[PDB]
């Protein structure tokens, strides 16, 4: 009956709620790029470009009684705008499957939506860490002015410290300090659990040490957690949309419009 037409929404309220719940929970339990970046806010689908700051040029303040001394104003070094990309993934549902879910009262399948959400979340993490090259986007792993630090010995008693403490002192020597957030590759984050060194590294930091599968074999970062240091412009959040019944097979698509803007590149350190 329903498929004998072209309708705007091939799903009822409860089915749509379940569809959104699945994608949201998959994003919650899969996203790690959101665990090292603060967010600018829900700007809206209309917003497609945001100003890029690049606060690489700073000057010290003045010390005067009358406040007539000249200090260069802190502002964008070169006013630039970056268009917000969109991350999307498509999945198809069979009209007979919706019919079976409705009539038989069996729960509707949203496992394809879960898979699409997982792929979209992995792609978001990949974009956040390793910036896209064709679109000219920089990432935390690859950015100019990054304060590269050698890790070398990691399998010693305090290998984690030979890189973490050096990174912390380098970031502090640049004026960037405070609650640190540390990310390691799964290999390093696993091998560093040898003798409780994870607790010492967490004591060194303040926001914690996470693991991201998108990182390479032996790589990691330590970053300042300030919204001033780094931000995540959110044009529109992870959501599910309908693409119109092509041949009565209903296609849907998970969507997410995010952009990583690094205001101060010195707040990031790569334990290369």
């Amino acid at each position: 009956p329903d498929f004998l037409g072209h309708a705007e929404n091939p799903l009822r309220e409860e089915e749509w709620a379940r569809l959104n719940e699945t994608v949201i929970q998959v994003a919650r339990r899969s996203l790690v790029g959101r665990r090292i970046l603060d967010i600018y806010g829900p700007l809206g689908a209309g917003v497609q470009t945001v100003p890029y700051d690049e606060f690489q040029g700073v000057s010290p303040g003045a010390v005067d009684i009358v406040g007539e001394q000249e200090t260069a104003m802190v502002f964008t070094d070169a006013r630039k705008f970056k268009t917000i990309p969109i991350i999307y993934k498509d999945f198809l549902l069979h009209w007979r499957d919706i019919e079976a879910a409705r009539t038989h009262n069996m729960p509707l399948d949203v496992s394809a939506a879960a898979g699409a959400a997982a792929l979209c979340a992995q792609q978001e993490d990949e974009l956040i860490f390793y910036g896209d090259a064709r679109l000219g986007y920089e990432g935390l792993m690859t950015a100019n002015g990054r304060l590269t630090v050698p890790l070398g010995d990691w399998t010693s008693p305090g290998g984690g410290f030979q890189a973490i403490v050096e990174a912390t002192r380098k970031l502090n020597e640049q004026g960037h300090f405070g609650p640190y957030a540390v990310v390691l590759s799964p290999r390093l984050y696993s091998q560093l659990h040898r003798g409780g060194e994870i607790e010492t590294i967490r004591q060194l930091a303040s926001d914690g040490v996470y693991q991201s599968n998108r990182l390479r074999g032996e790589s990691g970062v330590v970053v300042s957690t300030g919204r001033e240091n780094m931000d995540l412009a959110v044009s529109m959040d992870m959501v599910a949309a309908y693409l119109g019944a092509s041949r009565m097979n209903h296609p849907f698509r998970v969507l997410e419009a995010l952009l990583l803007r690094i205001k101060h590149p010195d707040a990031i350190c790569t334990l290369e």
Partner: peptide
Amino acid sequence: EKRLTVGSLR
């Protein structure tokens, strides 16, 4: 109003 489906985890 427009909202944030997957909020900031940090």
